[PDB]
């Protein structure tokens, strides 16, 4: 059962097609202007519009397959010495898949999940992450006995270490704001026992819920969705060499027809705005390379671009030691390079090389520049980055003033618990709604956004 049921819960946190379409794509991906163009998308992740289903598809897949089966597989391997190191993965394991739900929720059932369970408060849920994390990277021994049932790693114990600090320096950069000192302390601690090292230690699962569930959202969104004008033109204007390895180019005209020479083949579709409505229609937009959208396309969780760029962000803060800029460098070298593994075409060193160097982390634009390559680095994953936008404020999203947006273009700050724990579980829904200033509504905060 260990086996089989970390292996079931590995394929739900990327295959589960029915929360990726609508919590990765629709809200968070539309909320942070990562897509706009199709019509679930724009309609109402863009412009911010409610439907129950799509803001409870997390929660309700979570609890129905994910947080049970991790669950089980913490207490049937909890005192076998021949079974510690699989114990500790599960641990590991049980923070990635709840950290997604308290990130978008905020207190949730937890200590007491997996018929009347309280929601635990944000901070104490995010103090028992850190705990685990401590206490599984140090458990992870030669003598633990073997891992089975790992797609991330197949039971490499030594990656599964440094994936354990890199989710807890996660952790860390998500409470600074709220936690200044909790926050330190754990940073230096993630970056002390080692994070991940390059590329090769990412978090990935390969796909041959056996296929990738974005790309599922992707598929039935019926290709419509584009790179939004805010991404596109970033990494256009900057010379980023992500540009041709995400989008692909225009094949119409901003005036009608087949592109001529010289008209920019590059252009992203306008948060907001839908495909059909393009100046020169949708072919006058950029879309997306076909090798990102397949079922068969691998999904990223966890990287070393982003253990780089939260490391920029702690020595730019004085946490950990080192110089903020090679950080940097290193976070933005190793988002360029893990698209590959999408099949893109790698770039070529000289022009990383070259992107790097003429724009390096400047004198007081730190925490901009470093959000806005997060922001890029979290691209597919955007859960992680509305969670950073969120925390950060950055980057600084273009304006949403379509007339129906349901908040007058106010970004969503974090999706609601489905009223059926108010029919189910009607104490604690009113107690953790209590803790909100008494809603449970979208336009809510969760704990460590102090905005």
């Known amino acids: 059962n260990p086996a089989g049921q970390l292996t079931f819960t590995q394929l739900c946190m990327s295959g589960d097609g029915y929360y990726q379409h609508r919590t990765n794509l629709i809200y968070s991906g539309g909320f942070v202007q990562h897509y706009s163009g199709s019509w679930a998308v724009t309609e109402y992740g863009s412009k911010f519009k409610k439907v129950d289903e799509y803001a409870t598809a997390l929660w309700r897949n979570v609890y129905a397959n994910e947080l049970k089966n991790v669950v089980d597989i913490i207490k049937n391997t909890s005192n076998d010495p021949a079974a510690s190191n699989m114990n500790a993965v599960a641990k590991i394991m049980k ?37 685990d994390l401590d206490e599984s990277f140090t458990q992870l021994n030669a003598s633990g006995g073997s891992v089975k049932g790992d797609l991330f790693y197949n039971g490499d114990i030594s990656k599964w270490k440094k994936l354990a600090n890199t989710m807890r320096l996660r952790l860390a950069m998500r409470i600074s704001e709220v936690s200044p000192a909790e926050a330190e302390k754990q940073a230096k601690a993630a970056f002390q026992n080692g994070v991940f090292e390059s590329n090769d230690d990412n978090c990935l ?89 397949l079922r068969t396309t691998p999904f990223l969780h966890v990287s070393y671009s982003e253990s780089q760029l939260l490391l920029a962000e702690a020595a730019y803060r004085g946490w950990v030691a080192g110089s903020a800029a090679d950080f940097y460098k290193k976070g933005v070298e190793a988002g360029i390079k893990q698209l590959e593994v999408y099949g893109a075409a790698p770039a070529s060193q000289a022009s990383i090389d070259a992107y790097v160097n003429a724009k390096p982390l400047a004198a007081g634009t730190e925490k901009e520049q470093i959000g806005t390559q997060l922001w890029i680095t979290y691209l597919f994953n955007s859960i992680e980055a509305y969670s950073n936008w969120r925390r950060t404020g950055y980057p600084h999203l273009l304006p949403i003033t379509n007339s129906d947006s349901q908040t007058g273009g106010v970004v969503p700050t974090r999706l609601y618990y489905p009223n059926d724990e108010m029919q189910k579980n009607e104490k604690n829904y009113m107690e953790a709604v209590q803790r909100m200033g008494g809603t449970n509504d979208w336009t809510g905060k969760v704990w460590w956004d102090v905005n």
């Open 95 to 131: 923070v990635m898949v709840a950290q997604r739900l308290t990130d978008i929720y905020g207190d949730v059932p937890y200590s007491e999940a997996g018929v009347t369970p309280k929601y635990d408060k944000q901070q104490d849920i995010y103090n028992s992450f850190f705990k």
């Open 205 to 293: 699962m390969h796909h041959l819920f056996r296929g990738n569930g974005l790309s599922y959202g992707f598929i039935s969104d019926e290709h419509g969705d584009h790179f939004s004008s805010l991404l596109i033109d970033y990494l256009r204007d900057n010379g980023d060499p992500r540009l041709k390895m995400l989008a692909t180019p225009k094949t119409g005209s901003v005036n009608g027809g087949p592109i001529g020479p010289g008209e920019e083949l590059y252009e992203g579709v306008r948060p907001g705005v839908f495909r059909w409505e393009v100046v020169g229609g949708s072919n006058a937009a950029s879309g997306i390379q076909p090798y990102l959208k």
